[PDB]
């Protein structure tokens, strides 16, 4: 299991909806998605960064081809941050 990341082991649909319902479980504000940086909006290979802000403070951001893909990727990042399966997490002890 070491190499494989979480959303590569476990498939999800509507990850931003999952994130919203989890934040409602935790009783925090519904976050809003806002693009932070972008380049090539008119270009055929655009690049966007979408951050998810709860109570006007960011907890996750994600890159993407389009705004929607960047948004769902940022939701995925937030889910990783919550569940503690980040790539910067403590390795498995032996």
């Amino acid at each position: 299991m070491t190499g494989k990341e979480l959303f590569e082991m476990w498939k999800i649909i509507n990850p931003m909806g999952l994130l919203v319902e989890e934040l409602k479980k935790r009783n925090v504000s519904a976050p809003e998605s806002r693009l932070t940086r972008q380049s090539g909006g008119t270009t055929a290979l655009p690049l966007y960064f979408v951050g998810l802000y709860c109570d006007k403070k960011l907890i996750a951001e994600g890159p993407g081809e389009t705004v929607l893909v960047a948004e769902e990727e940022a939701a995925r990042v937030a889910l990783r941050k919550l569940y503690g399966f980040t790539e910067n997490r403590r390795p498995w002890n032996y």
């Binding site: 070491t2 910067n88 390795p91 498995w92 002890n93 032996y94």
Partner: protein, 101 residues
């Protein structure tokens, strides 16, 4: 030769270490250690008590055959040599830092 390594990662070394495969060893020299929010630099290398980097030997193998040809033109000077160097594989099992600072 300097490497950067983490846990559960492989490295290859161009010589044999006189160690049975599967055996664990502690790496003494450490030029640097770093986490997501901080880093520890040496002058040049860090203290022994500070770090604990452990690596297990996985494999000892002859490198793929390297050809070397020496050729000089219109002098009838041509020669081949095919060499296979020994090389060993290590896996970094664990990295730990001490409260000492």
């Amino acid at each position: 030769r300097q490497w950067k390594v983490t846990s559960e990662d492989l490295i290859l070394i161009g010589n044999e270490l006189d160690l049975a495969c599967g055996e664990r060893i502690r790496l003494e020299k450490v030029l640097l250690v770093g986490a997501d929010n901080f880093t520890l630099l040496g002058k040049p290398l860090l203290g022994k008590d500070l770090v604990r980097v452990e690596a297990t030997v996985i494999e000892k193998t002859e490198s793929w055959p390297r050809i070397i040809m020496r050729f000089r033109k219109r002098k009838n000077f041509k020669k081949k040599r095919i060499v296979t160097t020994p090389q060993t594989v290590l896996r970094i099992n664990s990295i730990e830092i001490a409260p000492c600072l």
